[PDB]
């Protein structure tokens, strides 16, 4: 296979501001209405998040723009999308994006996502092709439009679909879906969430708690990746590709100390970064979200040598 359509497009990455976002539960331990503080990889608040578009119609007629780049993993990765009609399935996470290293291949092929940690050959323009079988009248998914070879495979797993629809809602949800990917200590752990959003595109002020889905033995360093897509074929009209529109959100993680406020039921609402501003670092000293009127001594500063 390896059918490819680069369709490179210009313009600057449209950025955004994650207000309160990307706060997962960094333990299984159940806590109730306490302020807990750890320094771990997170997406720090008020951060620059790139609102990317995998397929982007800018109207004259048609003009679907396939931009989705191979992206470095860096420290850690955050992800968010709406996609009332799913066009997104999984990610290619790896290093060489080729053989010679393992490959993290997440395919949420309906309905049984078959997570794959293997050695593949990923094409220059990988994505999942979808077509119509004509036998049993079912839309299959050609998975080798992503990658040519599948062999040597180290790991395999299956679970209930992370990507999930509800719909019937004519919008007003958009089914905002977030996935956090953190690769440490032999365990690459996946996080998820599903949220209604009524706003046109960008994110609200609410907190999103992400539980760990599976903690898996991965043992590979992933320095780079790209997302996956679901497209199809059309027939004679003045081949068909780029079903609907596609856009998503990406931001990189970073070690930061958060104070975590659990609820009576352990549902974290308020989280606060300590290093965010000189004001945020004092609230980490009192451990409280209420700061009484007065003067408090935040950590010292030093002048540094030129």
């Amino acid at each position: 296979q390896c059918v490819n359509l680069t369709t490179r497009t210009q313009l600057p990455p449209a950025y955004t501001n994650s207000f309160t976002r990307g706060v997962y539960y960094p333990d299984k331990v159940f806590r109730s209405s306490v302020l807990h503080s750890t320094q771990d990889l997170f997406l720090p608040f008020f951060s620059n998040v790139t609102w990317f578009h995998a397929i982007h119609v800018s109207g004259t007629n048609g003009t679907k723009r396939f931009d989705n780049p191979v992206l470095p993993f860096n420290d850690g990765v955050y992800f968010a999308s709406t996609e009332k009609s799913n066009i997104i399935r999984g990610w290619i996470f790896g290093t060489t994006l080729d053989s010679k290293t393992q490959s993290l291949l997440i395919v949420n092929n309906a309905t049984n996502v078959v997570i794959k940690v293997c050695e593949f050959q990923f094409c220059n323009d990988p994505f999942l092709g979808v077509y119509y079988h004509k036998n049993n009248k079912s839309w299959m998914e050609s998975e080798f439009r992503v990658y040519s070879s599948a062999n040597n495979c180290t790991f395999e797993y299956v679970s209930q679909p992370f990507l999930m629809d509800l719909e019937g809602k004519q919008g007003n949800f958009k089914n905002l879906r977030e996935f956090v990917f953190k690769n440490i200590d032999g365990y690459f752990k996946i996080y998820s969430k599903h949220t209604p959003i009524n706003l046109v595109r960008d994110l609200p002020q609410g907190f999103s708690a992400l539980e760990p889905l599976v903690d898996l033995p991965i043992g590979i360093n992933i320095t780079r990746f790209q997302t996956l897509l679901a497209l199809h074929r059309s027939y004679l009209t003045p081949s068909g590709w780029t079903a609907g529109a596609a856009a998503y959100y990406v931001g990189y993680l970073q070690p930061r100390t958060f104070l975590l406020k659990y609820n009576e039921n352990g549902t974290i609402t308020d989280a606060v970064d300590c290093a965010l501003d000189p004001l945020s670092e004092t609230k980490c000293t009192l451990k409280s979200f209420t700061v009484e009127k007065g003067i408090y001594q935040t950590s010292n500063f030093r002048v540094q040598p030129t």
Partner: antibody
Amino acid sequence: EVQLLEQSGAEVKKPGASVRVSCKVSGYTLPEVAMHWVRQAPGKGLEWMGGFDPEDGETMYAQKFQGRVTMTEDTSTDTAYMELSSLRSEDTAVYYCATTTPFSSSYWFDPWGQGTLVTV
Amino acid sequence: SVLTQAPSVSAAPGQKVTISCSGSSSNIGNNYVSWYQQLPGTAPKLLIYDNNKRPSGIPDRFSGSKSGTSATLGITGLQTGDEADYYCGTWDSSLSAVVFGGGTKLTVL
């Protein structure tokens, strides 16, 4: 969009024989789109043949010619064999590989097939 | 075959004249019509599908209509290279199959 493979090649089979017709494709995969067949006799008109039915999901067979010609499909290699049997006088002719869409009625066929004559 | 159109028709170049095909309610009445072109010993080319839809690469100068059991293929702006046979077809539920007419070989005078 798509170009196809040939229908047969040149198949010349003297009387007392029968011939398969294997039409492959390119740019699509075989069972995302339905094939079709038409008799075309030189200096004459079209006579439809074979074919797949968007409704009911069956592969059609022209009633007039039904039972004399059969079709099979290999989805991965995109090989669709049209076997015509029991050679007769007027049945040597170009038989076109054609392809409408199973999704809708799509009486409109693929843009063109290149044609193959047979021999009786 | 089961449909009605003449063997041949002729007209002067650059003129405007069409070709029609007479079916029945059992064939053209409830079904969509297609039209095809072939040059001598060549690949018959889809002309118009549904009588209102041009395939990719078709001059806009062609149109179509369906009046009852009668379907006309709009042919305008005659060219020196437009001489060929045009074939009408539509879905048949009678024998539950695909049908065509005998074909009409145009001549540009």
